Ligand binder design. Structure first.
Ligand code: NA
Length: 130
């Protein structure tokens, strides 16, 4: 499913993402936008290390979910990577929260650093009623 901007903003707010570990909703929106264009079915294969980024937040199989095909990988979110391609994003949100409950926080995603860090993200939640 490809979410509409405000549809997603309210979806993430209902899931407890607004201010989660200090990260405003707008930052999560900016992340989803740049990672997948708000597409829950987005996947990206990394030929170099044989891992795959899954879903709306493009969570990587080397550390976060299990896909059975990434050598020496772990599964910190304790989920099948399949859970990260669901139209319903509750599992992906639980995993994204897990990701930020680590040393870097929202910085774990390079995309956030490139297109969201120190830029205006309020535009992503404008008019969404959040
Ligand atoms: Na894995």
């Amino acid at each position: 499913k490809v979410f509409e901007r405000c549809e997603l903003a309210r979806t993430l707010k209902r899931l407890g993402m607004d201010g989660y570990r200090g990260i405003s909703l707008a930052n999560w929106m900016c992340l989803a936008k740049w990672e997948s264009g708000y597409n829950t079915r987005a996947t990206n294969y990394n030929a170099g290390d044989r891992s795959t980024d899954y879903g709306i937040f493009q969570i990587n199989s080397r550390y976060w979910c299990n896909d059975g095909k990434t050598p020496g990988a772990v599964n910190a979110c304790h989920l099948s990577c399949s859970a990260l391609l669901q139209d319903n994003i509750a599992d992906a949100v639980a995993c994204a929260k897990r990701v930020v409950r680590d040393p870097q926080g929202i910085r774990a995603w390079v995309a956030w650093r490139n297109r969201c860090q120190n830029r205006n993200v309020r535009q992503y939640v404008q008019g969404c009623g959040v």
